[PDB]
mmCIF file with all atom_site columns, C-alpha atoms and ligand atoms in Angstrom:
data_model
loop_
_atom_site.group_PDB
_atom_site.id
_atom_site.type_symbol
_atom_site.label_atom_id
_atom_site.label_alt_id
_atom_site.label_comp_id
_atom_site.label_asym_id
_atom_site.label_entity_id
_atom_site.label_seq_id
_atom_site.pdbx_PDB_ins_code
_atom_site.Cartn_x
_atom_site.Cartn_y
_atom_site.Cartn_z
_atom_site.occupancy
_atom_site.B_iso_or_equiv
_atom_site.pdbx_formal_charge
_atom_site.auth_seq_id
_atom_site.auth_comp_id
_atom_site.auth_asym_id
_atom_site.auth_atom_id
_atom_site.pdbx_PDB_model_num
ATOM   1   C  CA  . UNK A 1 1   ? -4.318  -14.751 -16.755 1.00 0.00 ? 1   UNK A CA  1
ATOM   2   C  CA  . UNK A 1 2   ? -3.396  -10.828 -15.531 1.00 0.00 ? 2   UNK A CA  1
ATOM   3   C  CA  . UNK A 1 3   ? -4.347  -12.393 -11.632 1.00 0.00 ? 3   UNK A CA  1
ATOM   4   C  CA  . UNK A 1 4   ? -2.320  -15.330 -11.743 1.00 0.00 ? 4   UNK A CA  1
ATOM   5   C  CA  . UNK A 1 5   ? 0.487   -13.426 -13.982 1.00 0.00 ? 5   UNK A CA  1
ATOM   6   C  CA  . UNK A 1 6   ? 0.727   -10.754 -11.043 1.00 0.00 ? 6   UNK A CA  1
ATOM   7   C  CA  . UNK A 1 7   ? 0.884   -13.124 -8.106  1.00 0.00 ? 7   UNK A CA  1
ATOM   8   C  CA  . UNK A 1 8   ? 3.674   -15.639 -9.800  1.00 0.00 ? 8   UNK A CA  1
ATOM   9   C  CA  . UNK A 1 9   ? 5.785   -12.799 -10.089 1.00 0.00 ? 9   UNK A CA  1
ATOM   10  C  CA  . UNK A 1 10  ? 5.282   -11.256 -6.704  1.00 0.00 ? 10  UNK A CA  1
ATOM   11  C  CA  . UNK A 1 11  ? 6.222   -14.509 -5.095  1.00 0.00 ? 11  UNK A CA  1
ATOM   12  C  CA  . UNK A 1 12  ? 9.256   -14.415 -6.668  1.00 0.00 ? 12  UNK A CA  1
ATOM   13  C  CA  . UNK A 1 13  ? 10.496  -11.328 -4.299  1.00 0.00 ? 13  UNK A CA  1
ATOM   14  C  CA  . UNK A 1 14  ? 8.710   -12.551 -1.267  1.00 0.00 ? 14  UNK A CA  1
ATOM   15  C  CA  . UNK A 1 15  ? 10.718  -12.900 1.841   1.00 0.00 ? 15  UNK A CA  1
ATOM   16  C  CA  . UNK A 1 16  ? 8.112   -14.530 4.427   1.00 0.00 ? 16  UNK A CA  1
ATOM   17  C  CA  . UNK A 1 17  ? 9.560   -14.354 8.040   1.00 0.00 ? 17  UNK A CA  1
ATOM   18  C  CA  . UNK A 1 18  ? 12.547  -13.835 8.006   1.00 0.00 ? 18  UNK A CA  1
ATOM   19  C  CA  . UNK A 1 19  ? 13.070  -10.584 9.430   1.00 0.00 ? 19  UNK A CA  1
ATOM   20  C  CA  . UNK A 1 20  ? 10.133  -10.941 11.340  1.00 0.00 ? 20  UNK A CA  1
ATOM   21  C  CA  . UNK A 1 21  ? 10.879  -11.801 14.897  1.00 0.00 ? 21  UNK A CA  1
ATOM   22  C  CA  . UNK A 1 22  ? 13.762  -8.869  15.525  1.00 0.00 ? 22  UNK A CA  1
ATOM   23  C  CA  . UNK A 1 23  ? 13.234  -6.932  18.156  1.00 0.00 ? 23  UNK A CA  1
ATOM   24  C  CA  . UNK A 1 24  ? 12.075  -3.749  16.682  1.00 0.00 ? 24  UNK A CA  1
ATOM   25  C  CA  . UNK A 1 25  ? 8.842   -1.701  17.354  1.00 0.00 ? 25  UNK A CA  1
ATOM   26  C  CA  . UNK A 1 26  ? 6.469   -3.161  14.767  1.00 0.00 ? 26  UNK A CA  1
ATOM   27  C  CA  . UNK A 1 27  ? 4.344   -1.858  12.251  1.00 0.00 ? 27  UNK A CA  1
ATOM   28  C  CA  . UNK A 1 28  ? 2.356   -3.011  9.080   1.00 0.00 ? 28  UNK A CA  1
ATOM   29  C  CA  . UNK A 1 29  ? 1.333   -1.800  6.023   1.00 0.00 ? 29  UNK A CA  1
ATOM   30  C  CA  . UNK A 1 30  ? -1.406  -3.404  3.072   1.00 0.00 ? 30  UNK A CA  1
ATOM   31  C  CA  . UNK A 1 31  ? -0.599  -2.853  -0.351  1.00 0.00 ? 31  UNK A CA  1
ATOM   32  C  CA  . UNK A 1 32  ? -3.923  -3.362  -1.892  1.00 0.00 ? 32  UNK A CA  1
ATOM   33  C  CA  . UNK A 1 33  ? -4.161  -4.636  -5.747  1.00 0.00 ? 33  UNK A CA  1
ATOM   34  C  CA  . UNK A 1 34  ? -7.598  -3.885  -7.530  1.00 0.00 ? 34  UNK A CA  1
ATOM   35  C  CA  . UNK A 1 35  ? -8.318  -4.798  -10.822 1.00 0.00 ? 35  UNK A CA  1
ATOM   36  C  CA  . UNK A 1 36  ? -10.962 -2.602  -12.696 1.00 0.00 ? 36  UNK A CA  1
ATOM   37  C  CA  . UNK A 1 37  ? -11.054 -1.859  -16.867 1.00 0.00 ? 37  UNK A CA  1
ATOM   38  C  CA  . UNK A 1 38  ? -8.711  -4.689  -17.300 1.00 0.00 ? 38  UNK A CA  1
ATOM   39  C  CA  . UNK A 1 39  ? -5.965  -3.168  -15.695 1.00 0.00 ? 39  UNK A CA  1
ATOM   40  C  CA  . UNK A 1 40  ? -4.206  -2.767  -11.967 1.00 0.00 ? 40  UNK A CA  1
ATOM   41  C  CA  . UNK A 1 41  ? -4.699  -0.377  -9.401  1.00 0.00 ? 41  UNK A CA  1
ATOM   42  C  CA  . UNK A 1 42  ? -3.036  0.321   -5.988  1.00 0.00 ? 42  UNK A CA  1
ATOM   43  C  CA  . UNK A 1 43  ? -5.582  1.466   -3.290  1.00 0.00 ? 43  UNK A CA  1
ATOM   44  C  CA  . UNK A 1 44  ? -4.329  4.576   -0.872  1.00 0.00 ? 44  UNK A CA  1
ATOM   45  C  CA  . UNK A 1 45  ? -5.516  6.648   2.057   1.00 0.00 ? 45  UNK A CA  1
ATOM   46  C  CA  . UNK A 1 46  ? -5.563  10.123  2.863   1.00 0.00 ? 46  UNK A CA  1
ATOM   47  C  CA  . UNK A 1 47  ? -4.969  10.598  6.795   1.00 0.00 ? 47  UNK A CA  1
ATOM   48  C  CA  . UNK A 1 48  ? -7.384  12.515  8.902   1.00 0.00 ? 48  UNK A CA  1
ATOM   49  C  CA  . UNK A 1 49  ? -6.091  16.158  9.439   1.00 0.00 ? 49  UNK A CA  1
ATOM   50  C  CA  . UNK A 1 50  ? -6.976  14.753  13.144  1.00 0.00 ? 50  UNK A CA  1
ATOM   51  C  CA  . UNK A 1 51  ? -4.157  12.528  13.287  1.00 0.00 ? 51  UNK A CA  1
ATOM   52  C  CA  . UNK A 1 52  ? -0.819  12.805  15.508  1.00 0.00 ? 52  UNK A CA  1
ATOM   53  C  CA  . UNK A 1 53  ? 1.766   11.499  13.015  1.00 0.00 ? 53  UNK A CA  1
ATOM   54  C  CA  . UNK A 1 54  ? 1.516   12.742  9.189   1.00 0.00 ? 54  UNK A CA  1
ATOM   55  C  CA  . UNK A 1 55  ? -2.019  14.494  8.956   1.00 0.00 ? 55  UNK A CA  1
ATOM   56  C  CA  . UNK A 1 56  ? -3.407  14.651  5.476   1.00 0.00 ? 56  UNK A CA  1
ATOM   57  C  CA  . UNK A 1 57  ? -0.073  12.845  4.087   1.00 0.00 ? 57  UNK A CA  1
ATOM   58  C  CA  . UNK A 1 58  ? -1.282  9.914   1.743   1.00 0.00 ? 58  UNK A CA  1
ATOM   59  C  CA  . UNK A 1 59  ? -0.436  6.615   2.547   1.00 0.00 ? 59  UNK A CA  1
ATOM   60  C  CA  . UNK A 1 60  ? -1.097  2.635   2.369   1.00 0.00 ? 60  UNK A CA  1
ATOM   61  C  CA  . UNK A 1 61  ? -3.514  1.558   4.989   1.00 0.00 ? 61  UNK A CA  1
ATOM   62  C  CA  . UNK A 1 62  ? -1.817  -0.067  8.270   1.00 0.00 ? 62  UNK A CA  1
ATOM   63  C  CA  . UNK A 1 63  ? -0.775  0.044   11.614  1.00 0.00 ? 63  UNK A CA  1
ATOM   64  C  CA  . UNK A 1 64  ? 1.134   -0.493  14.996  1.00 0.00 ? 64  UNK A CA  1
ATOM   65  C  CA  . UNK A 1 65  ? 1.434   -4.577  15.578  1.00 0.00 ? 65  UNK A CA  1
ATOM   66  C  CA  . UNK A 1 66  ? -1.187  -5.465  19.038  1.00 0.00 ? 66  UNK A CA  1
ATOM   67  C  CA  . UNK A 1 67  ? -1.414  -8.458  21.117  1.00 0.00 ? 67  UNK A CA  1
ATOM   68  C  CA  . UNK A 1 68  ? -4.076  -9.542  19.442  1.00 0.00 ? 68  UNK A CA  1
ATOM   69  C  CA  . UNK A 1 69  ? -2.442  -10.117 15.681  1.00 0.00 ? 69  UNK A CA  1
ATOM   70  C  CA  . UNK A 1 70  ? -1.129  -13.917 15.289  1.00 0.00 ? 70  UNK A CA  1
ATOM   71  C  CA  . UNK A 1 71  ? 1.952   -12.492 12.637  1.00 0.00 ? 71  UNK A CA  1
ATOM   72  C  CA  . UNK A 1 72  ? 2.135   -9.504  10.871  1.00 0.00 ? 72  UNK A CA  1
ATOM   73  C  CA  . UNK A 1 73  ? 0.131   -9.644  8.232   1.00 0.00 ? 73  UNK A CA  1
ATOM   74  C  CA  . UNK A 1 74  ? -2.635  -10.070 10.617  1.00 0.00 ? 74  UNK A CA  1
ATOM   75  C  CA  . UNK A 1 75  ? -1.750  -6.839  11.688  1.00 0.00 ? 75  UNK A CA  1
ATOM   76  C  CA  . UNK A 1 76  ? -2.437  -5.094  8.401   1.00 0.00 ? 76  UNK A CA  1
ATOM   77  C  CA  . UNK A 1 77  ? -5.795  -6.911  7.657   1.00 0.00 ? 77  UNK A CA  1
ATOM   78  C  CA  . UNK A 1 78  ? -6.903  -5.632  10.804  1.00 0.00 ? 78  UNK A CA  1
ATOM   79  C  CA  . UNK A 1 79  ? -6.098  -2.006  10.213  1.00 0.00 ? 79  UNK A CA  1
ATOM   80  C  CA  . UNK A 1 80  ? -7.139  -2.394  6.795   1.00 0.00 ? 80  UNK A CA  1
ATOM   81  C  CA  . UNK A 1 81  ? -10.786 -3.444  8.207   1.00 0.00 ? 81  UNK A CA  1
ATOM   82  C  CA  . UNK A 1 82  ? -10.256 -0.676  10.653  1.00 0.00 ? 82  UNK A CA  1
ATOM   83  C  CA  . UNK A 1 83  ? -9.623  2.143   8.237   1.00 0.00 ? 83  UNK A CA  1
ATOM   84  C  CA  . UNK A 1 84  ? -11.660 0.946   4.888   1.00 0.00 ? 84  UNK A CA  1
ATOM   85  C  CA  . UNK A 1 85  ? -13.949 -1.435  5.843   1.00 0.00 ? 85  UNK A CA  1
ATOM   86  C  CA  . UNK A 1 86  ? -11.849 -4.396  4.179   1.00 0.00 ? 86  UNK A CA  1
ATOM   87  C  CA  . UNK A 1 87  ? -12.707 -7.401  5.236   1.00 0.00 ? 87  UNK A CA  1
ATOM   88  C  CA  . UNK A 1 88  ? -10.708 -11.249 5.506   1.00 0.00 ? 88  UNK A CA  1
ATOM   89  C  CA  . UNK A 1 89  ? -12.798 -13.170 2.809   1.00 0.00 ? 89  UNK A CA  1
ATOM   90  C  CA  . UNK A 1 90  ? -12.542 -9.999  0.463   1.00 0.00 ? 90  UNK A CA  1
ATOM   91  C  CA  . UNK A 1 91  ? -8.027  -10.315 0.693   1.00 0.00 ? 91  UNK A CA  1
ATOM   92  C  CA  . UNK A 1 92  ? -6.019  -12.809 -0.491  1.00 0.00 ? 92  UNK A CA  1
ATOM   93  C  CA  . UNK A 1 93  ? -2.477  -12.046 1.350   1.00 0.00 ? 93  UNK A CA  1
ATOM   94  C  CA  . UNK A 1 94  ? 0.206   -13.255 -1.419  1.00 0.00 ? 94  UNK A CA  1
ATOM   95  C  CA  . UNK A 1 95  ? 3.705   -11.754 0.070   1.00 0.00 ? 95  UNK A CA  1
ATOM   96  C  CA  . UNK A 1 96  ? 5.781   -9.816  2.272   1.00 0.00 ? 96  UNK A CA  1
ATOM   97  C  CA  . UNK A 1 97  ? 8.396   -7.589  0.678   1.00 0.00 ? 97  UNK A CA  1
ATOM   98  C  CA  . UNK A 1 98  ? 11.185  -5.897  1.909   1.00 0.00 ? 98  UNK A CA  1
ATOM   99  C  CA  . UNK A 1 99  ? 10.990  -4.124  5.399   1.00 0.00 ? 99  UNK A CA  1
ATOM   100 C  CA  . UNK A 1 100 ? 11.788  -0.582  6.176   1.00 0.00 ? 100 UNK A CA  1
ATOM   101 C  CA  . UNK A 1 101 ? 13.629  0.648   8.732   1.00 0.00 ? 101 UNK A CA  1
ATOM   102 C  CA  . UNK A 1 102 ? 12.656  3.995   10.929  1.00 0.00 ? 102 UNK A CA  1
ATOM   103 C  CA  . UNK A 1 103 ? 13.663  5.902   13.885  1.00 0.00 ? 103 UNK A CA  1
ATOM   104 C  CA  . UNK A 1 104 ? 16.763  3.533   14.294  1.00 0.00 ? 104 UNK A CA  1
ATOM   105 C  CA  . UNK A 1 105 ? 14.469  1.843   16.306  1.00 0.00 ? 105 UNK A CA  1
ATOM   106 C  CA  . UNK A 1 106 ? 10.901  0.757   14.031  1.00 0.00 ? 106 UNK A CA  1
ATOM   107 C  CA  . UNK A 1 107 ? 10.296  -1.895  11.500  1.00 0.00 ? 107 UNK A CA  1
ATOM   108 C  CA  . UNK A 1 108 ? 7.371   -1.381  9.191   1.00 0.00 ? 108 UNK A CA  1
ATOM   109 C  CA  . UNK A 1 109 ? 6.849   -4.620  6.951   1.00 0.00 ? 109 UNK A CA  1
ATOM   110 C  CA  . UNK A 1 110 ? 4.723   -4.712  3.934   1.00 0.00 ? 110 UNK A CA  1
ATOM   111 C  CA  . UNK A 1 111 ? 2.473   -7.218  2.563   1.00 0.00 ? 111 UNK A CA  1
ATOM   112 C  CA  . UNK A 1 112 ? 0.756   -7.558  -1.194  1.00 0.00 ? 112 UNK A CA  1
ATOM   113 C  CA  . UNK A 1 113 ? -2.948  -8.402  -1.013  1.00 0.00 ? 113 UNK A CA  1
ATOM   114 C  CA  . UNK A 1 114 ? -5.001  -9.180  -4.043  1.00 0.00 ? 114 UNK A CA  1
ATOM   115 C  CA  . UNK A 1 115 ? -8.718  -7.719  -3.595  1.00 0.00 ? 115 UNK A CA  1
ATOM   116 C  CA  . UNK A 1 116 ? -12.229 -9.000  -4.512  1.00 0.00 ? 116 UNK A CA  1
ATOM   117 C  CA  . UNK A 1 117 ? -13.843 -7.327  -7.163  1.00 0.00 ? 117 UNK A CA  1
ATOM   118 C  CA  . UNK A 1 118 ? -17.181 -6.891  -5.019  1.00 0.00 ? 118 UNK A CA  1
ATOM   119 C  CA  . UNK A 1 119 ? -15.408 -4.605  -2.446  1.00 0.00 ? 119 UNK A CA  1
ATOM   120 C  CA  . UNK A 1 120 ? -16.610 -1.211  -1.882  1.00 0.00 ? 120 UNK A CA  1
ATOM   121 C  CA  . UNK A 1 121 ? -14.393 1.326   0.492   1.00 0.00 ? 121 UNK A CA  1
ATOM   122 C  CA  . UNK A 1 122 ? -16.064 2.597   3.382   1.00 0.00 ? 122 UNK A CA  1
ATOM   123 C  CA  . UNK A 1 123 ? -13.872 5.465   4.741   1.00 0.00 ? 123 UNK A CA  1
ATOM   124 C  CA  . UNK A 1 124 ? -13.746 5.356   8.706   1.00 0.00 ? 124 UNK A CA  1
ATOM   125 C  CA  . UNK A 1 125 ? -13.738 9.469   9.049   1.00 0.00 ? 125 UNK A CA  1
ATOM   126 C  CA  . UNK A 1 126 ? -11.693 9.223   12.274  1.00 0.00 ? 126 UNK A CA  1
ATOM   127 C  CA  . UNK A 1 127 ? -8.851  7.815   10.296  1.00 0.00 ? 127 UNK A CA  1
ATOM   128 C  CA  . UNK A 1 128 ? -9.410  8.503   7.053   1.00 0.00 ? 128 UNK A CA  1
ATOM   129 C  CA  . UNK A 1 129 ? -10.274 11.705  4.840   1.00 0.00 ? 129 UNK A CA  1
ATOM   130 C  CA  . UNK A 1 130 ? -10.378 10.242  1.521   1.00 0.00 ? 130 UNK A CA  1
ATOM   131 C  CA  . UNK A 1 131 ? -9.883  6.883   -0.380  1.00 0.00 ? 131 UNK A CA  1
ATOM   132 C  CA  . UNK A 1 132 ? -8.647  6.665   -3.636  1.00 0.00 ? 132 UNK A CA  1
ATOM   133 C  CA  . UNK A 1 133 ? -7.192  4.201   -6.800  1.00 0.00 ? 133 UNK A CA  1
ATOM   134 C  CA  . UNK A 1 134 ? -4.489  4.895   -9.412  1.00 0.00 ? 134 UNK A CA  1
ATOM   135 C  CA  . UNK A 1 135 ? -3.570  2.589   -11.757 1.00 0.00 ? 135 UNK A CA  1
ATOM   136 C  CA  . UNK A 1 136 ? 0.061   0.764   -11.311 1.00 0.00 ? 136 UNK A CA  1
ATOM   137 C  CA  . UNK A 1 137 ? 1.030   1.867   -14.655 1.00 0.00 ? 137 UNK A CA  1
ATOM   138 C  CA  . UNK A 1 138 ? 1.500   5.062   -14.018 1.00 0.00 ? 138 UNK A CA  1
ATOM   139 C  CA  . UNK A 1 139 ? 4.240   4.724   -11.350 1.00 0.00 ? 139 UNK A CA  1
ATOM   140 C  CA  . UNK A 1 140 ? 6.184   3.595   -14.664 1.00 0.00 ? 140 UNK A CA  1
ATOM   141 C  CA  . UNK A 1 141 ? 5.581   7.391   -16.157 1.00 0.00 ? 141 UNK A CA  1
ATOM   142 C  CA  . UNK A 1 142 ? 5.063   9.521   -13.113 1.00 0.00 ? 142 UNK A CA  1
ATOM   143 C  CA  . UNK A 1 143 ? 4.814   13.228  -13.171 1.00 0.00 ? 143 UNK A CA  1
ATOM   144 C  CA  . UNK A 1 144 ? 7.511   14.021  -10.382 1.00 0.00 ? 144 UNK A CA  1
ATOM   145 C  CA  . UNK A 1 145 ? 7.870   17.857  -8.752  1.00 0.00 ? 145 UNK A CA  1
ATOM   146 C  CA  . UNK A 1 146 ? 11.091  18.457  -6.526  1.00 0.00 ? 146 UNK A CA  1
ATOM   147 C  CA  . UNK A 1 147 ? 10.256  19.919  -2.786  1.00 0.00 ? 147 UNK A CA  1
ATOM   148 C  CA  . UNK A 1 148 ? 15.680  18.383  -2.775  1.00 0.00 ? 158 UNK A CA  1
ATOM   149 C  CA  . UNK A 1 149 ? 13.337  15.280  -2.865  1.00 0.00 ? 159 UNK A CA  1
ATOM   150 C  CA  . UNK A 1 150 ? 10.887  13.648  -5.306  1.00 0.00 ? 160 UNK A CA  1
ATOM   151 C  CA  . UNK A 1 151 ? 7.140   14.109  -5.067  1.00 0.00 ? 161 UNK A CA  1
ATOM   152 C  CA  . UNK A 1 152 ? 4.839   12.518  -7.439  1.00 0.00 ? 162 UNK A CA  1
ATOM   153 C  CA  . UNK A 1 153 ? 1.341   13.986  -8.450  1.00 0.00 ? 163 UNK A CA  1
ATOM   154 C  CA  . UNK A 1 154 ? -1.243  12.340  -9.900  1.00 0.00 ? 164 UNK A CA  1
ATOM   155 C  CA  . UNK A 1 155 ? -4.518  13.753  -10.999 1.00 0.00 ? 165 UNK A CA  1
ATOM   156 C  CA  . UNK A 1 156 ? -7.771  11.530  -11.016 1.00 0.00 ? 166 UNK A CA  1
ATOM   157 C  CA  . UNK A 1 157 ? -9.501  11.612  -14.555 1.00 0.00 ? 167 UNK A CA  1
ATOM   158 C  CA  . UNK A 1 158 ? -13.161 11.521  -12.738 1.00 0.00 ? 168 UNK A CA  1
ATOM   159 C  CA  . UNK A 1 159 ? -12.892 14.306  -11.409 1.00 0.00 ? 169 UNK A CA  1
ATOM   160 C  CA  . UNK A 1 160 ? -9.744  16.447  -12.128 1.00 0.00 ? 170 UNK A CA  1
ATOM   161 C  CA  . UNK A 1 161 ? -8.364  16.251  -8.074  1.00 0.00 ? 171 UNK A CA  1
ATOM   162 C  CA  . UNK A 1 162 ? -4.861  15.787  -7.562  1.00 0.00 ? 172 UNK A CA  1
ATOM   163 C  CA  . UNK A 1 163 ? -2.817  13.884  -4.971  1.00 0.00 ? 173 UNK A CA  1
ATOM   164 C  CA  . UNK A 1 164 ? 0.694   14.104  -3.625  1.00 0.00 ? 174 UNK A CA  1
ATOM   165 C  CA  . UNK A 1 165 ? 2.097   10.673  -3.193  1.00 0.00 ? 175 UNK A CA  1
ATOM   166 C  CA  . UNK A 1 166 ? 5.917   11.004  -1.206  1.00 0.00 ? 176 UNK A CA  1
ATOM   167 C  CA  . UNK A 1 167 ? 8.214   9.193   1.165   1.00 0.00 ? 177 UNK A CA  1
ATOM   168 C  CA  . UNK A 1 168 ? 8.198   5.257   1.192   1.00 0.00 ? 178 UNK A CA  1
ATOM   169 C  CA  . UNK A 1 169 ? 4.570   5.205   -0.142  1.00 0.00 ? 179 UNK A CA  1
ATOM   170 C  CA  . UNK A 1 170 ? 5.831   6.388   -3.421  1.00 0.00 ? 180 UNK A CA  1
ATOM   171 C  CA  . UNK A 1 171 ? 8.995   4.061   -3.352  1.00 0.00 ? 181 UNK A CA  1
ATOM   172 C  CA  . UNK A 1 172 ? 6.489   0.847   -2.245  1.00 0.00 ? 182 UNK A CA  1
ATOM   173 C  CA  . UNK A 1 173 ? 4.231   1.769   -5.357  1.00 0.00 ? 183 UNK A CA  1
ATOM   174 C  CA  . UNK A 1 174 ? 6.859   1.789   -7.742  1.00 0.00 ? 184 UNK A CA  1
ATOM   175 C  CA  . UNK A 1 175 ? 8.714   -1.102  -6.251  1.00 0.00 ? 185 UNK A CA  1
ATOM   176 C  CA  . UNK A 1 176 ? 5.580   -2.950  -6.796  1.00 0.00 ? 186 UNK A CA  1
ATOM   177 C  CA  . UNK A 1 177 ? 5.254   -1.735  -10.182 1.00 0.00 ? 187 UNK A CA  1
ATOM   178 C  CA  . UNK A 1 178 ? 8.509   -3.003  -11.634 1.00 0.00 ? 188 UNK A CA  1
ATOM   179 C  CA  . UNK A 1 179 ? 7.671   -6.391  -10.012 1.00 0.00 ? 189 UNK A CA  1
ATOM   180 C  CA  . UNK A 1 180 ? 4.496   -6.930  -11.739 1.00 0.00 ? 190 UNK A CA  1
ATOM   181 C  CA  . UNK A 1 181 ? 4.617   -4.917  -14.975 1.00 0.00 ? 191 UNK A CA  1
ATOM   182 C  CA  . UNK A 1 182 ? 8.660   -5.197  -16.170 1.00 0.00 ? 192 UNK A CA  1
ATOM   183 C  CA  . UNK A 1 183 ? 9.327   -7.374  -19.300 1.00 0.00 ? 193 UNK A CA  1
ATOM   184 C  CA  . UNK A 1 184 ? 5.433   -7.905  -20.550 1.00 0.00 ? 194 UNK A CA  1
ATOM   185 C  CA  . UNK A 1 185 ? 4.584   -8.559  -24.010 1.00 0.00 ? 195 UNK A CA  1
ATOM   186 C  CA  . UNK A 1 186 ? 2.104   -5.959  -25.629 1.00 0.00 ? 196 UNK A CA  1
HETATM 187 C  C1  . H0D B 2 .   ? 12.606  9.772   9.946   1.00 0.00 ? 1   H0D B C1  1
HETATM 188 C  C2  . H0D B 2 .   ? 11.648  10.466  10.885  1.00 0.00 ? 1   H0D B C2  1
HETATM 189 C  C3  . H0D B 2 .   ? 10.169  10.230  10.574  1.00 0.00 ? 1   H0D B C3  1
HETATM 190 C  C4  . H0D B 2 .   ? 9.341   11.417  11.046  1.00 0.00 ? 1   H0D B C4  1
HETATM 191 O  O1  . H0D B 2 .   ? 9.604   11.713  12.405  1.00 0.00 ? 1   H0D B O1  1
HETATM 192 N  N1  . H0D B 2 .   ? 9.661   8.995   11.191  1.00 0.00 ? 1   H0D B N1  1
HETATM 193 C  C5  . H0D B 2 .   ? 8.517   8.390   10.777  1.00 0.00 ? 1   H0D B C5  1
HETATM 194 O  O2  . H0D B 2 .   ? 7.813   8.890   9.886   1.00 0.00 ? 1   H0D B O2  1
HETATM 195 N  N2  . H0D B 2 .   ? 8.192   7.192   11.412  1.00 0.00 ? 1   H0D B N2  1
HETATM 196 C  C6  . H0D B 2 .   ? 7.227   6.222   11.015  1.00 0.00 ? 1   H0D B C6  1
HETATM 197 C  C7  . H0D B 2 .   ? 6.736   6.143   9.711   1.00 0.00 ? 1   H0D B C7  1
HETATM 198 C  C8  . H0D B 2 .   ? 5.792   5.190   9.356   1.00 0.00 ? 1   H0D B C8  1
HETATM 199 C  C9  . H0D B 2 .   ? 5.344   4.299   10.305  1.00 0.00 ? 1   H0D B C9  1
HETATM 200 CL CL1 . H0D B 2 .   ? 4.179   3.081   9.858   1.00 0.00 ? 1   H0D B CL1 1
HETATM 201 C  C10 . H0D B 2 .   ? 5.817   4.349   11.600  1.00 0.00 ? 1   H0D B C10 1
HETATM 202 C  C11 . H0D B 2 .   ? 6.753   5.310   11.954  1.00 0.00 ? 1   H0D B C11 1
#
């Protein structure tokens, strides 16, 4: 099936713990997969314009790691609850790709969740302005405008609004992309 096509290959690049126990300042980020029409979708945020780092910027839900979280990825399934109402039963964490280094001194490690089909966002308005899907495809064939560096813009079909999607949100989505869509029969 497209579910258990899309988590075999994302297993394939998954590289668990390894870099998970350096001594970096820690931070998580969800990469949320939703299928609708037959076809896959990333989830993203838009910040609150209330927000100390990157107001308005879009990004994937996450987070700074707290005392509380048992590994990482517990750390962005609780911001992800935090920020969109998602909760545990309604993720199914598959892998942790490549971490990102920041700041010469921060590590921000993201994880692939599949989610239920019976999930409905409910934007947190102290951390989130908007909520929104686009479909994985499209980070195949983006339309890209130059700042030099790369910004893509996609505009939703429901109801002509467009986003800016930059920085290592864009390079995450089409890293993800490649994974899951490369060499598919039609
Ligand atoms: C290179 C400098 C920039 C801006 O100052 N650092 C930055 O954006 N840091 C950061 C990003 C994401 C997360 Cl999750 C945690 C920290």
């Amino acid at each position: 099936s497209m579910l258990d096509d899309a988590k075999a290959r994302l297993r394939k690049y998954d590289i668990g713990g390894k870099y998970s126990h350096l001594p970096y300042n820690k931070y998580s980020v969800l990469l949320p997969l939703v299928a609708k029409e037959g076809k896959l979708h990333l989830l993203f945020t838009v910040r609150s314009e209330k927000l100390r780092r990157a107001p308005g910027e879009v990004c994937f839900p996450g987070g700074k790691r707290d005392p509380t979280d048992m590994d990482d990825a517990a750390t962005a399934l609780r911001e992800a609850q935090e920020e969109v109402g998602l909760r545990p039963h309604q993720v199914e964490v598959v892998c942790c790709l490549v971490p990102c280094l920041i700041d010469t001194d921060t590590l921000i490690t993201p994880f692939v969740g599949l989610i239920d089909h019976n999930f409905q966002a409910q934007p947190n308005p102290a951390e989130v302005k908007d909520v929104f899907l686009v479909p994985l495809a499209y980070f195949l064939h983006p339309q890209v405008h130059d700042q030099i560096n790369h910004i893509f813009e996609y505009t939703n079909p429901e109801d002509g609004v467009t986003y800016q999607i930059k920085g290592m949100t864009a390079n995450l989505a089409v890293l993800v992309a490649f994974i899951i869509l490369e060499k598919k029969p039609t």
